[PDB]
């Protein structure tokens, strides 16, 4: 959310613009949980598990502060939990 | 195969072909399939041409043949749609044999362009479609002048324009013959009440008759002189050009 | 097609479940411990709710195909509500029944000569109609739900004046709130009638049989009339959940067991509320059968067979000025097969005590026009009155 | 606004059903169409559009008999109370239909065309070329939508491999398929057109509040008025 001068001009006028990513819901399978999970995600998100070398290693490596979703930490901890029992 | 063969000309049998016309459109496929030529002509007819003027429009486009029929059905519910149908679909499918193989969007902003931007009745624009079938090969901008060269320039209504068939005729040719008039006084814009102190010439008589009765008749003038400001009137519209 | 009933009207899907219940292994933080609402806590699933206790301001039925009465055959049931789409032409083909217009002979022989009438007759019946029509209450029109019960039963009044001449007439007394019960087949077809309503007289005597053996065993001649597009259960209730039972609605040992005229009663202001008088018609018919029926059973037996001696009940409809009158005698009760021996019934249609009344004056530019009272009175009608009820006791 | 549509029944019966006006308000409360409002008192009478519906028990082509045709005062079109089997159901009357008529519905199609009698529900595919119909559906079992108003006609044009062309009153074609229901036939109350109202008030009667008073020449100007090209710009408006 923010503002845009119009046709990259300062002495135009200044329009709110807001910005919206592109959502895909995709099917995922996570081998601790041994179940398919079908989120809404980003073309960042799918690249960011690319690098990662799976979904179970993106939940588990990437900080709250970067994975920024309620049900992706609730994932971590779950398999957290798993891990740890 | 021989099944398939049997079938297909009992069909063309219900469907009014004659045993002359069967085996010509037989000589007019190259390769396409029996099934496809099936159902090709099931959507002709189901739109509302007669089989003799089928037989003729692909004989002499047979590329027709290879087309889906998906888009066929899409392309032919479409045409429907806009009120084109039985009758005025052999005027424009002969002036325009490639109406079936261009895109649906170059047909669907020049009727908005029609509808909207020109402000055509939606009957006027099915009559200026029938009626001219060239329409759709320019482009808009040069139609839009055109129309609005007419409406201003000469004060002609839209009942009169789509009486008259003015829209078929060349814009330059229409351009000679109105300017040498205004200039000759013997046509005048009308003003902004509509009133014309002179009669003005009936748009048949400009345009449909030849030049040569058109010079005779309305400019009253000798050949030579409107060959003259032909090529005048030719200069300053490259200049015009130029300078825009 | 078109399904009835708008979608923003229907019952709303509840909300989607969290998410963190298709975790496994982890064990959800709802609102539930604190016993309210909060926004920001998983929704709780809670396990059904059962009272635990039978409490009648709160009872639940269980499910129709749970209960103890519950048959897949369904039966077709008559009461007292339903009116027929075809009327008399289909109550005939129900009861197996051949219909003969008039009333019989023995039964207006009664009334023919002057010495059964009633003395001043034409007064006594045209003081009932005013009284019942414009004497009745404070009120200047009295309702049809109000003069339509009381004309009936002034008529009976007056008709019950007559133990004078007739001494046998204190054998009958008339039933109120009486119902009846009487359960059969017609071509592999499931039919019961309850009867409900209106006045039950009763007598201690069986009335006599109408119709002789030859007139009966003429019945096999006659055939049933049928209609094709229309099925004869149609405007019947249809429930496959019921009793199959024959009843008189009387315990044995009643003193008055023979019932002798059943009086139906169209007491409705409305009228669309109102049946036809074809509907009324075969409502007489289906009733009649049906008590007819239920003494049959109940003294020769559950057998299906062509009874030796018939059974005799009369009827009488009216809807306050248009008066039916119907005799009805069942002589077999074998009425799955369409052949063979056919019960009886006379009718007669559309009898008319008065035209029109005028409980106000009519004035006509300050001209009495039609003064107060009663329109081409017709004592025709009171006669076959007088004579089905006479019926038997004379 | 707690407004909640009337239009809540969910089982088909012939009994009157008592509605509520909407007044030209949606759900919000506020106006979205203009000119209705008031009127006589009306109770809505459900109606069966789809023709070929067999009962439960039953199947295939049934009989079935009309019992009495009266005035709906929802539509411009007469119903008719029709009674079949052991259920009764309200239809759409064509021109000639009385009390004691017996009409056809079936879905049997036939290798020849048959005859084709008023009021009978047929496929597009078992009736002759030209017929008048009413009644049709784009869709088999979708049920009727089109030509339904009083004395409206459709004509079927022809048919090919599977699919029928028929020719809306509003000189349009449309594509559907011969599997498709219909009805012969045209509707009732053919001198609808040519009624009279007589006086406003009978207007009000009907349910329509009158027209707006105010002048809408830039209305009517902003849908007819064109832009000119800058060419063009100096022969707008030349002065007298
Ligand atoms: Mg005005």
Partial sequence: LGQIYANNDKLSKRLKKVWKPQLFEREFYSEILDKKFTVTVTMRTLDLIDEAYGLDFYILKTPKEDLCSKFGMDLKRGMLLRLAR | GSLELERVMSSLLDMGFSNAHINELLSVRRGASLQQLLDIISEFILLGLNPEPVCVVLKKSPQLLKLPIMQMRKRSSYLQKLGLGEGKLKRVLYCC??????????????????????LFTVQQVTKILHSCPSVLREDLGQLEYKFQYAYFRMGIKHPDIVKSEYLQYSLTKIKQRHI????????????????????????????????????????????????????????????????? | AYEWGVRSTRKSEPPPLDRVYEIPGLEPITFAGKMHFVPWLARPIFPPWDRGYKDPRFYRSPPLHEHPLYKDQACYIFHHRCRL????????????????????????????????????????????????????????????????????????????????????????????????????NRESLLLQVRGSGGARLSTKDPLPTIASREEIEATKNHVLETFYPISPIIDLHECNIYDVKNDTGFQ???????????????????????????????????????????????????????????????????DGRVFHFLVFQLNTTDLDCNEGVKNLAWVDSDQLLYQHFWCLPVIKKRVVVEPVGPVGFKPETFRKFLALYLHGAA | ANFVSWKSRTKYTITPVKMRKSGGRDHTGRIRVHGIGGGHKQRYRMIDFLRFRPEETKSGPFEEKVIQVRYDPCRSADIALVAGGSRKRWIIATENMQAGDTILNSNHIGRMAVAAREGDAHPLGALPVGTLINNVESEPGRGAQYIRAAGTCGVLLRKVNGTAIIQLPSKRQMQVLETCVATV?????????????????????????????????????????????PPMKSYVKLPS
């Avoid at chain 2, 006084?185 to 048949?204: A, E, F, V």
């Avoid at chain 3, 005229?261 to 074809?278: E, G, S």
């Fill in chain 3, 85 to 184: 789409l075809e009327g008399v032409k289909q109550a005939l083909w129900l009861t197996k029944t051949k219909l003969i217009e008039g009333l019989p002979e023995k039964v207006l022989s009664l009334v023919d000569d002057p010495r059964n009438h009633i003395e001043n007759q034409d007064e006594c019946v045209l003081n009932v109609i005013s009284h019942a029509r414009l004497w009745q209450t404070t009120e200047e029109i009295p309702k049809r739900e109000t003069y339509c019960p009381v004309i009936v039963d002034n008529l009976i009044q007056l008709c019950k004046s007559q133990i004078l001449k007739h001494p046998s007439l204190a054998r009958r007394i008339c039933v109120q709130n009486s119902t009846f019960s009487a359960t059969w």
């Fill in chain 2, 97 to 118: 044999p490639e109406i079936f193989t261009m895109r649906q969007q170059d047909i669907n902003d020049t009727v908005r362009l029609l509808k909207e931007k020109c």
């Fill in chain 2, 180 to 244: 040498y008039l205004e200039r000759l006084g013997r046509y005048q814009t009308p003003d902004k009440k509509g009133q014309t102190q002179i009669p003005n010439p009936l748009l048949k008589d400009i345009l449909r008759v030849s030049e040569a009765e058109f010079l005779a008749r309305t400019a009253c003038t000798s050949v030579e002189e409107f060959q003259v400001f032909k090529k005048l009137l030719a200069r300053e519209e490259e200049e015009s050009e130029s300078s825009t």
């Fill in chain 4, 185 to 229: 036939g045209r509707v009732s109350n053919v001198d609808h057109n040519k009624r009279v109202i007589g006086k406003a008030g009978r207007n009000r009667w009907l349910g329509k509040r009158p027209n707006s008073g105010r002048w809408h020449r830039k209305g009517g100007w902003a849908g007819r008025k064109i832009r000119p090209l």
């Fill in chain 3, 252 to 318: 044995e040992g009643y003193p008055y067991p023979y019932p002798h005229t059943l009086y139906l009663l169209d007491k409705a202001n409305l009228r669309p509320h109102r049946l036809q008088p074809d509907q009324l018609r075969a409502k007489m018919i289906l009733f009649a059968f049906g008590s007819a029926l239920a003494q049959a059973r109940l003294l020769y037996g559950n057998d299906a067979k062509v009874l030796e001696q018939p059974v005799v009940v009369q009827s009488v409809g009216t």
